[PDB]
Amino acid sequence: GLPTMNTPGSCQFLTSDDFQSPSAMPQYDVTPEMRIPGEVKNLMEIAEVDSVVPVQNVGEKVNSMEAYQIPVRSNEGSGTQVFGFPLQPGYSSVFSRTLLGEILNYYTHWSGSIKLTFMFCGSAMATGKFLLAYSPPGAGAPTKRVDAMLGTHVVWDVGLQSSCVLCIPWISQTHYRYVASDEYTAGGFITCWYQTNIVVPADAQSSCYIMCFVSACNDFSVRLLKDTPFITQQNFFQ
Amino acid sequence: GLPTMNTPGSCQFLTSDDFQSPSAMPQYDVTPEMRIPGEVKNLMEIAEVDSVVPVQNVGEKVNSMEAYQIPVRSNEGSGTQVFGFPLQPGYSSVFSRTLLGEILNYYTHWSGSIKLTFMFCGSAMATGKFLLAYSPPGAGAPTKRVDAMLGTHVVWDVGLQSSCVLCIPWISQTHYRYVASDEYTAGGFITCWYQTNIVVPADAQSSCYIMCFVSACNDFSVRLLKDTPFITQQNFFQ
Amino acid sequence: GLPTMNTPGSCQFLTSDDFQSPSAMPQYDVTPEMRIPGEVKNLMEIAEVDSVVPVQNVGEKVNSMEAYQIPVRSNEGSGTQVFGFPLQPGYSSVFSRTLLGEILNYYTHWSGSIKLTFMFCGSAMATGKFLLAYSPPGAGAPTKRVDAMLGTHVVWDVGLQSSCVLCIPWISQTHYRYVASDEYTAGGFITCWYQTNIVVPADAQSSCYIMCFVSACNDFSVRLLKDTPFITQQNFFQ
Amino acid sequence: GAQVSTQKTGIHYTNINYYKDAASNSANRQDFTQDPGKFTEPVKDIMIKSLPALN
Amino acid sequence: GAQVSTQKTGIHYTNINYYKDAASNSANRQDFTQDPGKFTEPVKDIMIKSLPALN
Amino acid sequence: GAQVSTQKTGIHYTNINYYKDAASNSANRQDFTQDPGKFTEPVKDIMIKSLPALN
Amino acid sequence: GAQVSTQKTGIHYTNINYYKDAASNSANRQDFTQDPGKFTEPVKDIMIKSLPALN
Amino acid sequence: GAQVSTQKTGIHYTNINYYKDAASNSANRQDFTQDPGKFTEPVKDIMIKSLPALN
Amino acid sequence: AAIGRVADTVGTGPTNSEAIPALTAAETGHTSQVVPGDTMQTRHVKNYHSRSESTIENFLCRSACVYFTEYENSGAKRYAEWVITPRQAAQLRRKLEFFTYVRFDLELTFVITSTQQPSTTQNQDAQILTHQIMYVPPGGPVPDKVDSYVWQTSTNPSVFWTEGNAPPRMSIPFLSIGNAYSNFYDGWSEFSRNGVYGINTLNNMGTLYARHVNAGSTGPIKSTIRIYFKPKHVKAWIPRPPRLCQYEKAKNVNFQPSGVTTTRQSITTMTNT
Ligand SMILES: CCCCCCCCCCCCCCCC(=O)O
């Protein structure tokens, strides 16, 4: 009988423990593996894949394809804001239900640059230039184009190349940010403006749509595994 | 006292556990072994041995040797079905109590080809040819000979070689099938037909019998050990 | 804290367990050993030593030296049985309390040949020959000399060499026999007869005695340690 | 002196017997020997599959 | 025969499997492989970042 | 420093004494010595089986 | 692969980490480093004890 | 790194200290040193048994 | 292949020879060795399926409750007793009887549980129960009362257990008097072919006795002891047909004639009816 001495923790049951345990099926012959397309090794592999962002949460539209449409049309001026949402990949309703956001919501911390790809779905004859911008926190969200261009931005010119990317560089005072909301962990404001208004010819629709895709960059990571707020129940399903 | 820490499972009693335990008979001298004919190493050794199948469950016959008899006789036509049962080595009453079936019923999964050996017990003077066939699931059991021959089959011609084999190749979408019944795990239909009716001479019985033996092939295996439904009790026997 | 996991048996107390346990007398200096004549290493060393068998259990004699006496005397015929007891070294009252028997009664199984040494305690002038025999089971105990000589036997002729041995060869269907009684484990019958009646001269006692010693052979062994039926009590002795 | 065998899969494990009696050892769950012949095919004259069983 | 791996940090640990079935082993928490390509970029013709996606 | 003996059969086991007193060690269940002579045959003059015990 | 350090006195001890995370290891109670300078003496110009601090 | 000493008798045992403080170690029950002189015989001039203590 | 792997499927093509794999003669007593490829074009299949879970050892190596009785705190039956046998339970018995002779060591496990009996005793305050199981090999003194001297066990092996702790457990060597346990015995105990008949003439495995060591409370308590068997290091010979008819008695193979199988409509019905 080898003199032993149990220590605190003994007999407990940690949900995240990691020990060996006897098989209930001694010598069971597992079914041989098989090459199945598209294996997944890390969730970040998924978070690097673009998914369509619902920038237009506005009212009832959340219950239609319109949620994914960004209104753009010919105006009698330029400088007009086209949209504007915060950099809260986890919290903001704009991202929260995205492929990226869904994943973030199973974690507590996030870090890395993010890509916002914008595809112009107007007509071949429609043209124009937009100013995609990212303003780090500290001041308020820019309210005029002339104040947004003072920050990190990309002047996108619509043409044969349908889409254009606004890479939101990870600028932050800490290594990681909270997936949940917190002002310490404030991420800044993402806004779009008209650089040079939409200009179509006759017989070509002057009102268009712009889609927005979001995905993580190669320097993106997530920490502290937690449960999603997005799924609930009252009783075991039957 | 070596610092230790018990983990979940500690003190339990798994029926299928595998640990060392003190002998209650310290240094007991076991009786020396002896060479006894026919040792058994794996149950599959048994499942590879033919046993007579009771194809004729029909009514009261289950209580007589008749259960193991397959009626064959001279007709005024050909194409007539002679029998037909499913490929459910575990469930179907035809197999369930066989040597193969008994074993299968102690497991949950099975896989492999099966051999159905058919011995013609007519008289030396009796002749004829039968069409042994196996139709994989997907359609229904063939209802006419012309529809069964469209599947895996063997045209057996009775002669000096009394028996003939219908090897039921393991065709299936999964590696294993359930021993119990389940339509996902459907195994198909095994049927027999008259290729060229029985033809005896005068003074020779025109009504005969055909026996059916079943056994596993060298690619047969069984998984997930369980209890048989075939044995029960109400109180400890006295 | 080394992750550990207790298994069935833990904390129990097996009477025949074999573990290490702390000394209550740390560093106690044992008394040095000493050469004491006659050390014992195995009980079989004892079971190989002859002890006088009480063949004459008959009635009240068990309470006197007579129990160890075998009556022999001059007759008016030959063939007369002299004694007869079974081969149940453990059970039969004849052996049960012997040196061999006492030991056997602390075990469940026994195996091996046995030696029955017979010493003639008649007078120097007394003569005669006896037929010591052992009949394996299967038939009944021989009832006539002519039926006992059909079995394993030794015709002992009394003379200067006082004693004579009847080696009872271990014939049996199993490797071991039960120390307790059981007909499967039947051992046969040991009987003695007059080969050529006792013949003394005048002035020399015609009624004599023969002693019987029993001991184990070098192929004798015992298994499955148990408690003796021969010792009991009602309360701790004071 | 421990031993080291292979686990079941589609890696090894260490074992040290702690008791003086072999009876105390864990089960022999990995003896995969097989010899169907004793049962299927106990014929005195070898029967060659492709041939006729009688002639 | 034990094994010795590296712990997570910004040292090693010893492991000895005690069961005959691989199923009984602890989790494989250190497989850091990554292959985004299968998902992001499953195009038949390689697309060079600096180039135009269409011409 | 452990020891390694043979178990009883018709394999080995490892043992490591953990206490400072020999009294604490497990039993010596494997001493199969035998010397019947001390008891059966303690005669001063060797008696040869095949011979007569007296002459 | 265990480690072997020295205990505190006026002998050694063995340690084997059992967990995959360094966070699980015991405390680092034996780091006797010392550097008072950062606090006592954070002057840019070295002050020589025996000398006058000002001249 | 364990140690291996001798048990008390008329065999050895293995020991591995598990704690970082020597205070935690088991007792030193085997120090059989002896020096009666300090007490019996603390005389400055050696007294030879066979001789007279005074002359 | 891999020690326990299964045969791989050999790819085959069209045939037209006088080779007759499919024609044989069951009369020989020989089982055909045909494989898919013999009667149909097959593809090649590297089969990795193992027969690991079919070894005699894996098949008989699972604890099985073979019996259980009860004994009470006080009253008439204060101690239990059971003539050791694997034939009172049907589960394990049917498996062991898959083979004529068998040889194995046995892992014994006991599940001991207690239940408070209904009574009218005021203020009951039970102390922890400690039981004692004791084995008495054929020929040894038996206990006649819960406080008989026999429970001294100077030599009989016995376990002492205390409620709360893991189930007591211990290993048992192959105890046969012969070279293998016999599952069937078409013979008698007497040479006259009288006395006992069947398996029970060989069963002489002794008796097991359980009891409490302390009464615990003033109230009445009943304890149940479940005995589990687990064959280890198994060797089996001469397989036989699995038991068909339900078990009737524990000391013989007596049965009530049963049909060969469940029925169905006609030899054409693909349904179990
Ligand atoms: C506390 C010690 C308990 C010891 C348990 C001993 C049980 C013996 C088991 C014998 C096993 C199965 C044998 C069937 C016997 C037969 O029919 O020949």
Ligand SMILES: *C(=O)CCCCCCCCCCCCC
């Ligand atoms: C025979 O192999 C002896 C060699 C190694 C014996 C050690 C057994 C394991 C010792 C490490 C301490 C284990 C704590 C359970």
